[PDB]
Ligand binder design. Structure first.
Ligand SMILES: Nc1nccc(-c2ccccc2)n1
Ligand SMILES: Nc1nccc(-c2ccccc2)n1
Length: 158
């Protein structure tokens, strides 16, 4: 049948030449895991403006520009609505990261990416982001730990 309907999300990775900024989610879905900054796109809001807003809300940072790097669709067994996640990166940040209600930030050196405490899917697509390759992916999860199916492809244009 038809693909499930999806909710539009953004995900932002602050990626500098030697380090990446990650936030530990403090509560709720995905609590305890390190990852990028993001959330739901709002009505009338462009995707990139939503990405800027979520980054500012969750880390306090503003950015000059955001670069589109990928798109990932997430499906969770038992929930028919998908997450349609537009992934961005930036390397020019203004301000300092601050702990928010949602996220506790730390910088990680790029030879210390904490995959064991990140979402399982990050092990597959984060290496492509680091190579400056654009990608489309899909991950079907049972709960928060188990991947039942995934697809991933490098693309020329996100
Ligand atoms: N790495 C990962 N894995 C599963 C889900 C997500 C997600 C990110 C931003 C917003 C909503 C979901 N991210
Ligand atoms: N807590 C939870 N569990 C499973 C799925 C979801 C979901 C959230 C937003 C959009 C699509 C799915 N949320």
């Amino acid at each position: 049948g038809a693909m499930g309907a999806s909710r539009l999300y953004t995900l932002v990775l602050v990626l500098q030449p030697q380090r990446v900024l990650l936030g530990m989610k403090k509560r709720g879905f995905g609590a305890g895991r390190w990852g990028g900054f993001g959330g739901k796109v709002q009505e009338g809001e462009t995707i990139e403006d939503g990405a800027r807003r979520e980054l500012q809300e969750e880390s306090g940072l503003t950015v000059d520009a955001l670069h589109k790097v990928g798109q990932i669709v997430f499906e969770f067994v038992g929930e028919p609505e998908l997450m349609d996640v537009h992934v961005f990166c930036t390397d020019s940040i203004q301000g300092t990261p601050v702990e928010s209600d949602e996220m506790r930030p730390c910088w990680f050196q790029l030879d210390q990416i904490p995959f064991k405490d990140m979402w399982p899917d990050d092990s597959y697509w984060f290496p492509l982001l680091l190579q400056k390759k654009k990608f489309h992916g899909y991950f079907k999860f049972q709960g928060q730990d188990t991947i039942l199916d995934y697809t991933l492809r490098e693309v020329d244009t996100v």
